[PDB]
Write a protein that binds this DNA or RNA. Structure first.
Ligand SMILES: Nc1ncnc2c1ncn2[C@H]1C[C@H](O)[C@@H](COP(=O)(O)NP(=O)(O)OP(=O)(O)O)O1
Ligand SMILES: [Mg+2]
Ligand SMILES: [Mg+2]
Length: 430
DNA sequence: ATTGTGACGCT
DNA sequence: AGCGTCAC
């Protein structure tokens, strides 16, 4: 009752770019706009691998991971843009730079946590208080929320999508208690107003559209964001959680999409997030550990404490290449040449990072995968990163991995290498 | 023959 | 440190 905290202390948003790499390519090439199109990596094997899909193409069943030749079977008019290739490998620089455009705009409004190349969490608690005191008890007009959905509404006692959106928004705004600067629902609503402004700024200043979730924590904000993609934002209130979670598959919640979530389902014999409420905290800790158990106990009630971390920049800079099937590396000169290619791309990125961000990486991580290993990475080893020099970095990487060659003759490499990876980490101010 | 990333937990 | 999980 009076002492059960409800996880309503913060306003958190998650902003996620719509079909991001496609929008980057559509901005550059107007011929691709408003078309079924996808972004592909490589081309020789089965037309290349799709990594991003416009919503028009999704209507035909085109998905990420699909080979372009197969996507063309579903959508013969599908347009394609290829990822740039440099030093024999896909190079993601255009999309990293477009990401920086977006992240810098978001940072004007509040502290952000860069969660991926196309999404960031925003802690809007302080901006909301500021806007509430600036408002001074004035009601919030539906005109300030032109792309907002209120999850769970309309309910209780039109057949077009926009009409239903507005009905739900009207119900929400009519029930709002604007006199209380401490009402969590009012705080979320003001947060949604700010996120409308943020998303309008992103679109105006970059051309890119995005979706967003607004709630009281990161997990609910991320879940909310997906409910009404594309080009829309969704408010998930604390009160909306019991109905929303009552039919929400456990795998849809961030961090439960893999083996842990499958074990929750298997061990407890449940399917939906809401069913977790019927277990004690101790029961959940007994099955999934102290940390996971406490997290699940609170999360299924809509409560999570994970902070929005003040971090706009990636904390590692990595370069990797797969060598699948018959292309696996089997000679010493091959391994050396590709380590050099990776190191040269890495040195380029690291030198730019040092100039832009006043920091230097101090550790080099070298990872490989050998033919036959089902795991993604076979061995990882670190060494010192003291100079941004590609030849030195590639020589050091080879020195670190050379004992992995089981071949008697040095000139060959056994077993063949199906992946190389160089990662710069452990950044220090400079 | 997904690929190229990137954050964080465990021991 | 080196390995595993999870999601982009
Ligand atoms: N498995 C993968 N491998 C490589 N690149 C990937 C990838 N998954 C995504 N990307 C790249 C390409 C993606 O554009 C970008 C952001 O990933 P999302 O936010 O998961 N997906 P998007 O923004 O395309 O669509 P929407 O958010 O509207 O559903 O990261
Ligand atoms: Mg996205
Ligand atoms: Mg994303």
């Amino acid at each position: 009752g009076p002492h059960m905290a409800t996880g309503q202390d913060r306003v958190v948003a998650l902003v996620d770019m719509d079909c991001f790499f496609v929008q980057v390519e559509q901005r550059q090439n107007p011929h691709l706009r408003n078309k079924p199109c996808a972004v592909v990596q490589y081309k020789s094997w089965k037309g290349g691998g799709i990594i991003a899909v416009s919503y028009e193409a999704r209507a035909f069943g085109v998905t990420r991971s699909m080979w372009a030749d197969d996507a063309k079977k579903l959508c013969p008019d599908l347009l394609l843009a290829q990822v740039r290739e440099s030093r024999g490998k896909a190079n993601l620089t255009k999309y990293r730079e477009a990401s920086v455009e977006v992240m810098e705009i978001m940072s004007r409004f509040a502290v952000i946590e860069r969660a991926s190349i196309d999404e960031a969490y925003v802690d809007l608690t302080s901006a909301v208080q500021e806007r509430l005191q600036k408002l001074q008890g004035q009601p919030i007009s539906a005109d300030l929320l032109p792309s907002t959905y209120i999850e769970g509404l309309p309910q209780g006692p039109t057949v077009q999508k926009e009409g239903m959106r507005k009905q739900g928004l009207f119900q929400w705004l009519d029930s709002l208690q604007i006199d209380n600067l401490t009402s969590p629902d009012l705080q979320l609503t003001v947060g949604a107003v700010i996120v409308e402004e943020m998303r309008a700024a992103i679109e105006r200043e970059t051309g890119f559209q995005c979706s967003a979730g607004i709630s009281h924590n990161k997990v609910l904000a991320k879940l909310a964001c997906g409910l009404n993609k594309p080009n829309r934002q969704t408010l998930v209130s604390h009160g909306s959680v019991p109905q929303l979670f009552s039919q929400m598959p456990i795998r849809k919640i961030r961090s439960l999409g893999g083996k842990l979530g499958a074990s929750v389902i298997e061990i407890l014999g449940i399917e939906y997030m809401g069913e977790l409420t019927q277990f004690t905290e101790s029961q959940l800790q007994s099955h999934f550990g102290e940390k996971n158990g406490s997290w699940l106990y609170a999360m299924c009630r809509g409560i999570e404490h994970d902070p929005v971390k003040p971090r706009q920049l990636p904390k590692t800079i990595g370069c990797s290449k797969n060598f699948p099937g018959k292309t696996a590396l089997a000679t010493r000169e091959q391994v050396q040449w590709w380590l050099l290619q990776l190191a040269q791309e890495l040195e380029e990125r690291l030198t730019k990072d040092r100039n832009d961000n006043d920091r230097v990486a101090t550790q080099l991580v070298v990872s490989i995968r050998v033919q036959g290993d089902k795991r993604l990475s076979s061995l990882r080893r670190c060494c010192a990163l003291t100079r941004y020099d590609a030849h030195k970095m590639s020589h050091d990487a080879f020195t670190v991995i050379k004992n992995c060659n089981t071949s008697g003759i040095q000139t060959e490499w056994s077993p063949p290498l199906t992946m190389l990876f160089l990662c710069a980490t452990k950044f220090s101010a400079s």
